[PDB]
Design an enzyme around this catalytic site. Sequence first.
Site, PDB file in Angstrom:
ATOM      1  N   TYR A  57       0.839  -1.190   0.000  1.00  0.00           N
ATOM      2  CA  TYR A  57       0.000   0.000   0.000  1.00  0.00           C
ATOM      3  C   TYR A  57       0.875   1.241   0.000  1.00  0.00           C
ATOM      4  O   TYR A  57       2.010   1.201   0.491  1.00  0.00           O
ATOM      5  CB  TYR A  57      -0.958   0.016   1.201  1.00  0.00           C
ATOM      6  N   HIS A 110       7.559   3.003  17.138  1.00  0.00           N
ATOM      7  CA  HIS A 110       6.845   2.331  16.059  1.00  0.00           C
ATOM      8  C   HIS A 110       7.565   1.046  15.684  1.00  0.00           C
ATOM      9  O   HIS A 110       6.966  -0.036  15.685  1.00  0.00           O
ATOM     10  CB  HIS A 110       6.707   3.303  14.869  1.00  0.00           C
TER      11      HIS A 110
END
Lengths: 230, 230, 230, 230, 230
Positions: free
Chosen positions: E130, E153
């Site tokens: 994506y 993250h």
Amino acid sequence: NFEELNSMQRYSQFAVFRAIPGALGSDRAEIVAQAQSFFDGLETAGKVEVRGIYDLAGCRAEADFMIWWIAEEFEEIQAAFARFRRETVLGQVSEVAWLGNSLHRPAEFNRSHLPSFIMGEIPGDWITVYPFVRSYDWYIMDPQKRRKILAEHGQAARDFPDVRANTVPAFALGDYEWMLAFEAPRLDRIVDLMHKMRYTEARLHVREETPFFTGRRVSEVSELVNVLPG
Amino acid sequence: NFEELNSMQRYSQFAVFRAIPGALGSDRAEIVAQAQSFFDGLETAGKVEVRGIYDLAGCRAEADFMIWWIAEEFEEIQAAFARFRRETVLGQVSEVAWLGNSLHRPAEFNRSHLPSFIMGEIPGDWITVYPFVRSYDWYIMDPQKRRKILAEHGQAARDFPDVRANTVPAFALGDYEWMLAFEAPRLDRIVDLMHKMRYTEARLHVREETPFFTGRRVSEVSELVNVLPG
Amino acid sequence: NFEELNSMQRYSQFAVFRAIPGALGSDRAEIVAQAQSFFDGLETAGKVEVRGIYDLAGCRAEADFMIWWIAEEFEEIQAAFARFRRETVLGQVSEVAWLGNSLHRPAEFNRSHLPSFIMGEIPGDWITVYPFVRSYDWYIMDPQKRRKILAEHGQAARDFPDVRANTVPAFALGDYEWMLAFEAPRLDRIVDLMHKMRYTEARLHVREETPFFTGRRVSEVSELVNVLPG
Amino acid sequence: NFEELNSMQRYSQFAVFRAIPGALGSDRAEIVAQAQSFFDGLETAGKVEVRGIYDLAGCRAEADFMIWWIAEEFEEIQAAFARFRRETVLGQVSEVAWLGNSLHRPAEFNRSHLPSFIMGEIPGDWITVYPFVRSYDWYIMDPQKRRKILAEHGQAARDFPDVRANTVPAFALGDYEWMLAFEAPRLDRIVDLMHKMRYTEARLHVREETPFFTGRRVSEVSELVNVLPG
Amino acid sequence: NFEELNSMQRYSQFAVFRAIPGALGSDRAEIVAQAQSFFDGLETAGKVEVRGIYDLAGCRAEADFMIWWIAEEFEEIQAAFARFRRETVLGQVSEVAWLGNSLHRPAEFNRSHLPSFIMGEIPGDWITVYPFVRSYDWYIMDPQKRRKILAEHGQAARDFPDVRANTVPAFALGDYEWMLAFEAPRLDRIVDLMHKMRYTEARLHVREETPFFTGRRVSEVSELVNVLPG
Ligand code: HEM
Ligand code: HEM
Ligand code: HEM
Ligand code: HEM
Ligand code: HEM
């Protein structure tokens, strides 16, 4: 006469059409004659006034030409639009890309401001047309504040008297609240006016102002038909 | 009376169709007869009530006509819609552009407010139809505050008694929360009402109110078929 | 000369075309000859200057090639675009995917900043083109603050002198406010410049910057035609 | 058994198809037989379980029917979907409008809440299906606050025990985060539940919840095929 | 080693194609042979490396398969893409649905983090792809704050070492800023990783992360061609 102009009823429509490649053909004399006869019949009937026919080639991908016409009753505009799509080869070989409908109403504060077509001015060589949607809180804002904002907005356009403006309400006639059309002898004047108008407080209360349609007025339908693709 | 009207179950559908150019043709007598026979059979069956057929020509690029019909069960509406698309030439030569489904429910606060089709009023000559989605926090807002906002909203439409409103819940029947349909003898009344309704606090709690479909009611299907593009 | 360069009137257009599969065929010699003759006639006429023809294969799904051309009058660009779509097989077998129109104007603060095509520089081997829309409050912000932001923005590109920038006003010529085109000998330089320019305060005042069109300049139209699909 | 149900691996897919008008024809006995044979072979193979086939006529413009099927491995669902599109006339004459994929996972807080298809309940006569995307800050919210919000949300649906809910994670299987499917014996129950569920704090943390697909379960594929447009 | 990997130049492209129903036909042996010969010639030429061919059936409505290929120069990728669309029947009977372009660059903070294709790892059986667009203020954020957010993250993916990540800059190569591709032996691992990644502060700085393309790698092009719709 200003009261009569403000109280008169006039529906206006910008019908934008896109040409279908390979459908018009190369022999177009009979198509030109049929379209010209259709517009002459429209003029003779006296119900729908064709303000202009505009060549939109090169403006955007999904548009090819535009018809600006005005009638007292909206059913007359409906009949003219359907007849153009039904009984003319030019209408049959084109798709409807966008319709901008509006109904003439007097301005909220400055009632001396009227659309150029309401005052019967000569249409300009170049036109730009787009719909407009204000912010959600624009109409419930303090009337004095909105009036001051609109006065400053109008004052910001004092250096472009050659650009005539048409601001018409469009509620319930589509997805938009207003229809705006600017006519000028030169396209660069329209571009400069649009650039200058960004320096206004009213720009803080905008939700939608697209799509744009910029075109050149043609003297007759033959000039438009002879340049269409396919 | 009012309790029964608030307790009755009625599904309503606005089926919007777009004409495919080059498919209808020029000979339309048999098509008109077949469509009229289909609608007469629908009326005779007594399950689906066709509230109206509306000509949407000139309203927007992607719509050509609309059928407003109401039935007690949604299965009946499904069967009527599928049968119209399957067994009529008019249905076969048209594309489905948009479907607005709704189920009648009593109002939250003002239970005396009822849809015009629930009251069995005569349909107006002109209609506007659009879906509606409220803001995310609209329903969890303090009930008194929302009730006052809705009361002011309703009161703002006190000057348009000739415009009949139909506000029907549309949850889980599509992408929207409400279906709104306004009927009026004149289109300018609808435009003026929509302009006036912008001056309400409820406008601060709007997320989606498009697309719009504005149309004129036709007396019979022949009037609609004879104006569609070839 | 800088005053004249800031005062000259030049319309610029990026016409993006998508190839229709199965329409061009396998025998393309005559198509190449006709397209080359069309462009040679455009050059001979002296009104529309074709700055470049770019192969957009592999950039995005809806684009195949692009023509960047500049003319003094916008009607000349309209005529060239319509003629390309009408009288050339290459224009007949392609669809218009996107049109980027702009009119050259002097910069607001740094009047020494000029478009690469206005300065008459040699076009780069690789180009990227996209429209741009600023935030609503961008133009009414304190002029000194905006000038400082723009100065920092321009200064952030100190390390990419090989990437030539064209920033042209696009108001009323479409849905956008600016048209941006960056030319560089290497694509990676454009990618690195775009990555580096994200570290600027001006990024806080962006509304729309899509779609992007990245392409390689071709020496002649035969090189472009011989790689098109179908 | 609850631990086994929570640890079970099950991929689920809602495949939404739109009928192409003029492609199915009028003679559909052999098409019905072939589709029934395909589904019987799917059942016999024992890999893909067809939970339901739903008629979506009248729900939205771009959908005609839907297949809800579940398999242990996603490659089995891929194979079944490809085979339906490739080796059946019904698949060949239909377009894929929307695909909703999901993988069964235990709930975050209330591990006793399980999808209706995981518990092996009888499918309802009416279904509604839509994807769901939460707000950006929803998952990094304080776990106690999110748990309380979800508890109130679940409690708000205490008055609709006849509506069975299916909430399945959909991350990386599409553009969405969750797939939601509600099955009820009556459509009005689904509408009322959706209306009532708007009165929850969770509505403050919604980003996308469209498109909706509302349909009626058919006993056999013949009932669906016999109502599709010709 | 790591310096060379961070300094190497590699363009990567995900070319997503959608099959046109009714175009491929039932006899596919010669089509398979031609496609295999095209890919063998690509491998022999040594310029464009085909990382993978993926079956996207059942993922989304508008995609059917995907080609992931990498080359040193973007001109080589352009030539390979155009040649695939031009000289292979498989390319001619398919339409490009989406193109994801990217250019490999070293990471901002953790320079030891490299794309899985740069490190030459074996491609996984399942992939998800994506594009990604960060928030407007993401890059002008305090570098220490952004570094800490990115560290948290990355650390949040400590429990998925079997999922290999490819994060590549995509500026000026399309409408996006980054291109993300995750490869894993099992699809459920990708789903679980995507679900777990939602619990990070970085989710507060996301503007666009769609569309998604999830697929299964095929050993040879015959396996892909034999499952495409006829
Ligand atoms: C020569 C150019 C222009 C002139 C002379 C002008 C002047 C005016 C004036 C006098 C009004 C009456 C407001 C009132 O008193 O109630 C008005 C209304 C309006 N103008 Fe302009 N304007 C120009 C350009 C524009 C532009 C560039 C836009 C949008 C980008 C615009 C949008 C509007 C709208 C939407 C209204 C409706 C009033 C409202 O929104 O409440 N006009 N204009
Ligand atoms: C003659 C015109 C109108 C009348 C008489 C009217 C009056 C009302 C009344 C009495 C209610 C019920 C209030 C309650 O249950 O407490 C209502 C509901 C509603 N109205 Fe109107 N209104 C009109 C026009 C409009 C317009 C122009 C819009 C939107 C642009 C609109 C949107 C709605 C909606 C969405 C509801 C549902 C209640 C809710 O959202 O919670 N109405 N209206
Ligand atoms: C080598 C690359 C670039 C250079 C040298 C550069 C420099 C400049 C300069 C000097 C101006 C004049 C502003 C003024 O004086 O008023 C300007 C304007 C502008 N630049 Fe750039 N810039 C570059 C890249 C970019 C990028 C990457 C963007 C957007 C993503 C951009 C968007 C704009 C826009 C929209 C303007 C119009 C001024 C305005 O918005 O008010 N430029 N640029
Ligand atoms: C009869 C109807 C419903 C019932 C019984 C129900 C109940 C529940 C329960 C118990 C959970 C588990 C949450 C947890 O503890 O982790 C849940 C999750 C969820 N529900 Fe519902 N709910 C219903 C309707 C709805 C509706 C109408 C929506 C959206 C419009 C919705 C959206 C969700 C979502 C997205 C989740 C995933 C958890 C999350 O977002 O973090 N549900 N529901
Ligand atoms: C196994 C899975 C993942 C791992 C190991 C991982 C780890 C990393 C690491 C170490 C970086 C380097 C950042 C730096 O040093 O500056 C990075 C960058 C990045 N990651 Fe991930 N991540 C994963 C999944 C994801 C996901 C699920 C997303 C988005 C939904 C994502 C979006 C990004 C982006 C856009 C960047 C570019 C840096 C930036 O945005 O400034 N990654 N990742």
